[PDB]
């Protein structure tokens, strides 16, 4: 069986699957072969209505641009508020014509691209001023953003690749793997906190991997693949950031875009679980903190930034593992004043909050059940067709009849319904590897007496050492009873073979230490009948 997936979930996509037809050797000769297929509509569960407001226009329409590129703080979150509205159908909520707002966005966003590009150095780095000393951190923020917007408006690949190759050539260390030029200062509402006391290499290696991963889809050349594999691996091998969840979370989030099924990544998120903050008996709200230094600030601070960035990265880690059940109590935490401001107009935080709702609302539409599913044979024709919706979620079994390979498929659509196929078969004792101890029995009048005869069979490479310990069952028709006091000879006799016996469910059970393969071991017992039934089933 499989999930179907018309849209991409679980690091892959699953719009088609094919199940073979097999012919085992063990089979009972004149058998019929039977199969059943059924499909379960895996609904989203609840959806939490987490959104940017109409005030999302104020997040586009940035706070005053200026020197030290407060113009940069004015460009960058446009490249996210676009992406939210685009994945949200949200312009309708503005109550203009949505097309006029979409055209306005595409234009203002292109003006944004020229505006950010104006801070590019001739080395394809960037700086705090056009004449400033270069920064890899800001080169990596630009690469994170360019990685976003080429999903929407294209810019030439060389303009990306040279900015990548500045960073990837000149600052890719070993035993620790991305490095920085010591810019004049961290910008007081951009950048973020480093690893504070020391040891900023984790925040660099993560934030730089995060930029490079976003861009890498639009500069796929061999060098950059060669770089990210080690920029991840040195991040992974360093990543035990217990001194800060903010460092554990940016390192987790970076690695969430990586191999989502690498054990160290899984282990990092398993620590991120152990770091979580919750409320309620089941998780009603969920978030994260690291530095327990606290005040209940009505105006936010870098202490809030520790939370909102560590959480937005945990949220984005979880939302790259595609599970709304895990993500929900976080999305409940956002949007209402836990520690205020939606990123507080720190660009770094506010970006990571908008990115949160974006990947959440994308996953919401990816998960909903609106899917049509088809099943056919491979050489033979169609078997059935199914339509799966907010009502018709249960896809009843249909017989599978025609002895051929079975193909299930879907188009585009949405959701994650799962299709299960069961096969039923009946198999022989003698013509299969299930039997090591080959059986015979005879009933004779000399009330009556019964003699079983049987022998062991070693593997081709093995001597006649005999069978292991075994549990043996002599079934009898109901109301027939064995001579137990004669049976005691199998227990009392000096030539012992059986340890013990019992009667259970009307069957006679006895337990045997070993069995010869040199010859058939034969055993005899006697029976009396209080005949109980008109029809008797065959005894085993």
């Amino acid at each position: 069986g499989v999930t179907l997936d018309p849209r991409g979930i679980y690091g892959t996509i699953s719009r088609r699957k094919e199940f073979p037809y097999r012919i085992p050797l063990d089979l009972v000769p004149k058998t019929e072969i039977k199969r059943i297929l059924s499909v379960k509509g895996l609904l989203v569960g609840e959806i939490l209505s987490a959104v940017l407001s109409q005030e999302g226009i104020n997040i586009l329409t940035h706070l005053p641009k200026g020197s030290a590129e407060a113009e940069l703080m004015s460009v960058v979150p446009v490249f996210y508020v676009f992406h939210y509205l685009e994945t949200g159908n949200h312009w309708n909520i503005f109550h203009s014509d949505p097309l006029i707002e979409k055209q306005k966005l595409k234009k203002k966003l292109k003006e944004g691209m020229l505006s950010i590009m104006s801070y590019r150095n001739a080395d394809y780095s960037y700086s705090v001023w056009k004449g400033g000393s270069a920064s890899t951190w800001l080169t990596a923020f630009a690469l994170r953003v360019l990685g976003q917007v080429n999903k929407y408006v294209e810019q030439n690949q060389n303009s990306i690749c040279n900015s990548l190759l500045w960073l990837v050539e000149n600052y890719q260390l070993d035993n620790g793997s991305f490095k920085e030029n010591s810019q004049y200062q961290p910008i007081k509402l951009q950048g973020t906190l480093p690893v504070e006391a020391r040891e900023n290499s984790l925040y660099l290696t993560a934030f730089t991997v995060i930029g490079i991963r976003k861009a890498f889809d639009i500069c796929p050349l061999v060098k950059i693949d060669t770089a990210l594999i080690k920029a991840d691996n040195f991040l992974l091998e360093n990543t035990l950031p217990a001194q800060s969840t903010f460092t554990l979370a940016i390192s987790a989030y970076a690695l969430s875009l990586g191999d989502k099924t690498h054990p160290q990544f899984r282990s990092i998120v398993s620590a991120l679980k152990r770091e979580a903050l919750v409320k309620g008996n089941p998780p009603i709200y969920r978030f994260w903190k690291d530095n327990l230094q606290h005040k209940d600030s009505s105006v936010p601070n870098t202490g809030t930034a520790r939370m909102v960035e560590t959480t937005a990265y945990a949220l984005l880690t979880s939302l790259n593992l595609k599970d709304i059940n895990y993500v929900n109590p976080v999305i409940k935490w956002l949007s209402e004043e836990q520690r205020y401001g939606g990123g507080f107009y720190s660009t770094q935080d506010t970006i990571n909050a908008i990115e949160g709702l974006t990947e959440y609302s994308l996953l919401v539409k990816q998960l909903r059940l609106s899917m049509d599913i088809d099943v056919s044979y491979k050489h033979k024709g169609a078997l059935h067709n199914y339509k799966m919706t907010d009502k018709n979620f249960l896809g009843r079994p249909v017989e599978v009849l025609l002895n051929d390979d079975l193909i299930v498929s879907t188009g585009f659509g949405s959701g994650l319904a799962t299709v299960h196929v069961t096969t039923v078969v009946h198999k022989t004792s003698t013509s299969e590897e299930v039997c090591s101890f080959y059986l015979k029995i005879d009933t004779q009048d000399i009330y009556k007496r019964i003699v079983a005869c049987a022998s062991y069979k070693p593997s081709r490479e093995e001597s006649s050492s005999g069978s292991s310990h075994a549990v043996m069952d002599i079934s009898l028709p109901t109301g027939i009873s064995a001579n137990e006091e004669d049976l005691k000879a199998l227990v009392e006799g000096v030539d012992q073979l059986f340890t013990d016996y019992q009667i259970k469910d009307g069957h006679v059970i006895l337990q045997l230490n070993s069995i010869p393969s040199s010859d058939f071991l034969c055993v005899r017992f006697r029976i009396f009948e209080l005949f109980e039934v008109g029809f008797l089933s065959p005894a085993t």
Binding site: G1, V51, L52, S53, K279, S298, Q338
Partner: protein, 261 residues
């Protein structure tokens, strides 16, 4: 309620900060009930709002006090708003003295981002509950089974219902033989069986601070190979090339090719 109560104090001050009072006579501090100002008087000054003096107090004339803030000057080109006040209740004229406390404020230009939709209930002790005990669980169902060797649960819940299902599969080196879901039976069991992880890939082993190895790939397929390598001019320990074996290679990891570079 605490957050909201700080926030109300800010608004309350913006409305009722006695800076808005007309200049106090004889250097009293202005104070405002909400609806009237009265001046708090200095030793040697009296009347309802300090209008008159003892004969000694007339000698002071120091006169150093604020009028209100201007409204915020919008963002300073590093995204911080600000505001200032101007020492402009009755000025330090005949004598001379500074009004007390920093003349200016800077405050990050913070605004709202999301649809308001009320407020959540929050209490100080709670949030550090990384772990808490299993619930009374009256909707009996099943808790999460521990997935098999090298395994990973795809859909994660506290409590799966009767007839509800979970998907598994092996981690990045590996693939499931057999059916990769399980389902919670009415008795609370999962009937886990008829599934087995197989290796198809291997991963760059742990090595010393000198790279005694060349990292060709992210994942290595079984029957491919990895090479131990000196950076320059010596040989130390381990096989030069190795191929993977359903198990890992049996690679050198206590020490690697730590040559005299």
């Amino acid at each position: 309620k605490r957050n909201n109560l700080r926030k109300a104090l800010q608004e309350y001050a913006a409305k009722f900060d006695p800076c808005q009072c007309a200049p106090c006579p004889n250097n009293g501090r202005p104070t405002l009930s909400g609806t009237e100002c009265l001046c708090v008087c200095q030793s040697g000054t009296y009347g309802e709002n300090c209008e008159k003096q003892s004969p000694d107090y007339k000698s002071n004339a120091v006169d150093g006090q604020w009028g209100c803030w201007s409204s915020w000057s919008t963002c300073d080109a590093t995204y911080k708003r600000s505001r200032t006040r101007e020492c402009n209740n009755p000025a330090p004229q005949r004598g001379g003295k500074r009004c007390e406390g920093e003349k200016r404020q800077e405050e990050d230009c913070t605004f709202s981002i999301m649809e308001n939709n009320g407020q959540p209930c929050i209490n100080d002790d709670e949030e550090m509950k990384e772990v808490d005990l299993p619930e009374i669980e009256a909707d009996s169902g099943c808790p999460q089974p521990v997935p098999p060797e090298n395994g990973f649960i795809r859909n994660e819940k506290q409590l799966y219902l009767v007839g509800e299902d979970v998907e598994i599969s092996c981690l990045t080196g590996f693939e499931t033989v057999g059916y990769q879901y399980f389902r919670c039976l009415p008795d609370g069991t999962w009937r886990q069986g008829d599934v087995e992880c197989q290796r198809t890939e291997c991963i760059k082993p742990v090595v010393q601070e000198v790279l005694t190895i060349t990292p060709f790939q992210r994942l290595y397929r079984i029957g491919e190979s990895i090479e131990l390598t000196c950076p320059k001019g010596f040989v130390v320990a381990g096989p030069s090339r190795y191929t993977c074996q359903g198990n890992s290679w049996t690679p050198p990891i206590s020490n690697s090719l730590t040559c005299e570079k």
